[PDB]
């Protein structure tokens, strides 16, 4: 399930970076961005394999690539944040 | 549940020199490694008492020992990561 929506202003800086790299197509800090997400756990809504993409939001300081990303969806902004390495995901609303 | 499966190279670095003393069975660097994980919060599937062992994963910087910790149960393979002081929870993958 997702747990709501959150405004794309309550979340880290970096967050806004990503989707600024994602309207652009790149390129992007990391090999696995842009991946396919299997969504393997059922977390997010059931789709056909490549409706969804994962991206890296960069955690300050981190030698990896962390615990931050944001999935795409191939609707018209759809588009979800982890913090905690996809246990959890919102929904982001970038109008606010 | 289990949050997913995550690549052992997916990891920092010393998710990997954990995995290394515990399959040497140390010595490991902390009193507390290698005592029973209790599973209190029902994160990881049942078991009796005793199934589990945590570990620590140092983290670099940290003053403490931080909250990165491996956690065996005694099927082969069966070596768990959390990075949140065990809040969630990753299977490690050790083939990538």
Redesign the interface.
């Known amino acids: 399930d997702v747990s709501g929506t959150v405004c794309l202003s309550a979340l880290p800086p970096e967050a806004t970076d990503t989707l600024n790299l994602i309207a652009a197509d790149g390129p992007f800090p990391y090999s696995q961005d842009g991946v396919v997400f299997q969504n393997?756990?059922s977390v997010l809504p059931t789709q056909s394999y490549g409706y969804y993409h994962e991206y890296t939001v960069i955690t300050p300081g981190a030698?990896?690539?962390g615990?931050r990303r944001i999935i795409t969806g191939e609707a018209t902004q759809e588009d979800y944040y982890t913090g905690?390495?996809?246990?959890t995901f919102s929904l982001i609303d970038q109008t606010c």
Chains 1, 2 share one sequence.
């Not at 905690?84 to 246990?87: E, F, L, R, S, V």
């Open positions: 393997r756990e030698r990896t690539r615990t905690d390495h996809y246990a």
